[PDB]
Amino acid sequence: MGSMERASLIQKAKLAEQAERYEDMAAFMKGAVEKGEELSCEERNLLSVAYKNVVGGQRAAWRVLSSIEQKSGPEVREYREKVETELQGVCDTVLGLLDSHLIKEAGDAESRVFYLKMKGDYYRYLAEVATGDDKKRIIDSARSAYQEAMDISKKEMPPTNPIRLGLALNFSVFHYEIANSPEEAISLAKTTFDEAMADLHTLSEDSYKDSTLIMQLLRDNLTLWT
Amino acid sequence: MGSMERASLIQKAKLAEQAERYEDMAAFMKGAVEKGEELSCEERNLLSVAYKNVVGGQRAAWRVLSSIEQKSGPEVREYREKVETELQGVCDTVLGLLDSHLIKEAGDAESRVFYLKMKGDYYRYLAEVATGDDKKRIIDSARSAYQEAMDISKKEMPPTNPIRLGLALNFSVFHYEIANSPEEAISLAKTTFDEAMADLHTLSEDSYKDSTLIMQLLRDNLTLWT
Amino acid sequence: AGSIPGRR
Amino acid sequence: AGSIPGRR
Numbered sequence: 001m002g003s004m005e006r007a008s009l010i011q012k013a014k015l016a017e018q019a020e021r022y023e024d025m026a027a028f029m030k031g032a033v034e035k036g037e038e039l040s041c042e043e044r045n046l047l048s049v050a051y052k053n054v055v056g057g058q059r060a061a062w063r064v065l066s067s068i069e070q071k072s073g074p075e076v077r078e079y080r081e082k083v084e085t086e087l088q089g090v091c092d093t094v095l096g097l098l099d100s101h102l103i104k105e106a107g108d109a110e111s112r113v114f115y116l117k118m119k120g121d122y123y124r125y126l127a128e129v130a131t132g133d134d135k136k137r138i139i140d141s142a143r144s145a146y147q148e149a150m151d152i153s154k155k156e157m158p159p160t161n162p163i164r165l166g167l168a169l170n171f172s173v174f175h176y177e178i179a180n181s182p183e184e185a186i187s188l189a190k191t192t193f194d195e196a197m198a199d200l201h202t203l204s205e206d207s208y209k210d211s212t213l214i215m216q217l218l219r220d221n222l223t224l225w226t
Numbered sequence: 227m228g229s230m231e232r233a234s235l236i237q238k239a240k241l242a243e244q245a246e247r248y249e250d251m252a253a254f255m256k257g258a259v260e261k262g263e264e265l266s267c268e269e270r271n272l273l274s275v276a277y278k279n280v281v282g283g284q285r286a287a288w289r290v291l292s293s294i295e296q297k298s299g300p301e302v303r304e305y306r307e308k309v310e311t312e313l314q315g316v317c318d319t320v321l322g323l324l325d326s327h328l329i330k331e332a333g334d335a336e337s338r339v340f341y342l343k344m345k346g347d348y349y350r351y352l353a354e355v356a357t358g359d360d361k362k363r364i365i366d367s368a369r370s371a372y373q374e375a376m377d378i379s380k381k382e383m384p385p386t387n388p389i390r391l392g393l394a395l396n397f398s399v400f401h402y403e404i405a406n407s408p409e410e411a412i413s414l415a416k417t418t419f420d421e422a423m424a425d426l427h428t429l430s431e432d433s434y435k436d437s438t439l440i441m442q443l444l445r446d447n448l449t450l451w452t
Numbered sequence: 453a454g455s456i457p458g459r460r
Numbered sequence: 461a462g463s464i465p466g467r468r
């Protein structure tokens with residue numbers, strides 16, 4: 001996308017979202033990042049939404065095939081390996097964008113927590129399919145990225161901040177689904193929900209809506225886990 | 227897909243449908259066709275379902291962008307042209323498979339009507355986006371393919387045959403949406419529905435279900451058109 | 453105006 | 461266990 005203007009890539013990424021063309025959206029936002037310039041708050045959302053959709057469809061297809069494989073020629077394993085390899089390529093692509101050079105140039109808490117949360121998410125997606133000599137190192141890479149984002153968010157963001165809430169939500173899912181730490185998952189979601197509850201009185205009606213929506217997602221997981 | 231077995235391509239196309247990986251499904255079935263062997267009834271359905279899904283998502287994205295373009299830099303037109311070109315490539319790919327060499331080797335009425343119906347459908351999809359010196363010739367290519375399939379189906383199939391019913395349904399949509407012939411569309415759907423109604427008494431419970439489902443689609447269009 | 457639905 | 465929903 002080196003020959004297209006930065007503004008045109010952003011413009012076409014928003015059009016791709018409207019058309020539900022998420023692979024195009026990710027390719028447009030990949031080219032926008034590779035222009036070398038930092039991303040605005042809205043542009044960070046476009047990057048996250050694009051790749052979360054692409055990898056989300058890959059994860060759903062991987063789980064369908066892995067379930068058929070476990071119920072059970074080499075066709076099922078070959079095709080699962082095919083989807084798994086393409087999923088790992090997308091995760092590696094996002095992690096490469098964060099490492100070159102989004103994270104090192106993110107100085108504000110809003111941007112740095114956002115990118116480190118992404119880094120934990122896409123290492124978590126790699127962990128969902130890992131079975132070899134790297135599984136433990138991938139899990140620790142996800143934990144380390146989540147933990148740094150947690151440390152900054154607790155120091156620099158109010159308890160009701162949507163990025164802080166979504167970070168704690170996904171980190172709690174990491175504890176439950178990846179790290180085999182359901183008690184850590186329940187404690188984080190509960191502490192996050194309660195501290196956000198006590199901070200709701202400071203918010204406007206629009207910020208109140210933003211925070212309570214994510215707080216309900218934490219409540220949904222707690223109801224499922226307890 | 228020249229290095230993969232025919233049976234493995236069919237096997238993986240069914241797995242791709244389960245995983246809702248329709249681009250993979252189409253690529254698998256394209257390789258299966260290019261093995262040179264005729265397709266079974268089930269294999270014909272796999273080919274049709276795969277490309278109908280792929281082009282269906284392209285058509286929906288094209289209509290979103292074309293609507294934004296009509297409401298309105300060159301970004302919207304460029305991206306619409308991009309989706310439009312990729313849609314035309316998929317349609318050309320299916321039409322190439324039918325022409326090389328599915329149709330000429332289809333001797334039975336079930337297979338020949340099925341492929342000619344496909345040929346009319348994918349020329350109709352090309353007609354939906356055509357605006358240049360070929361628009362009329364593309365429309366006539368769709369009409370000619372539909373008409374030959376209609377002639378064979380009336381001679382060789384009972385009025386309740388699902389392929390005959392689906393052919394008349396799509397040909398009626400061609401009359402209404404493409405050929406600017408709504409009266410021809412209403413007459414075909416009505417005559418098709420009534421002649422199938424009079425033939426339902428010959429069917430088993432399972433064939434009764436198959437036919438009445440498509441008959442309701444004809445009824446839905448008639449309710450919309452009258 | 454509905455054509456034959458694509459998938460199943 | 462639900463993570464942050466992808467799209468909007």
Ligand SMILES: *Cc1ccc(C(=O)N2CCC(CCO)CC2)cc1
Nearest residue numbers: 045162163166167464465466467468
């Ligand atoms: C990490 C993260 C992402 C997004 C939010 C948020 O504000 N949400 C959840 C999804 C969102 C649509 C995608 O932007 C609408 C509300 C919080 C935390």
Ligand SMILES: *Cc1ccc(C(=O)N2CCC(CCO)CC2)cc1
Nearest residue numbers: 271388389392393456457458459460
């Ligand atoms: C041209 C055509 C295709 C399919 C049918 C049919 O039997 N249908 C409609 C969709 C179908 C799922 C796809 O196979 C289920 C019932 C008729 C005519």
Ligand SMILES: [Ca+2]
Nearest residue numbers: 004005006007
């Ligand atoms: Ca420039």
Ligand SMILES: [Ca+2]
Nearest residue numbers: 230231232233
């Ligand atoms: Ca062989």
Ligand SMILES: [Cl-]
Nearest residue numbers: 078079082238
């Ligand atoms: Cl494969």
Ligand SMILES: [Cl-]
Nearest residue numbers: 105106107108
């Ligand atoms: Cl900076």
Ligand SMILES: [Cl-]
Nearest residue numbers: 012304305308
């Ligand atoms: Cl473009």
Ligand SMILES: [Cl-]
Nearest residue numbers: 331332333334
């Ligand atoms: Cl033959």
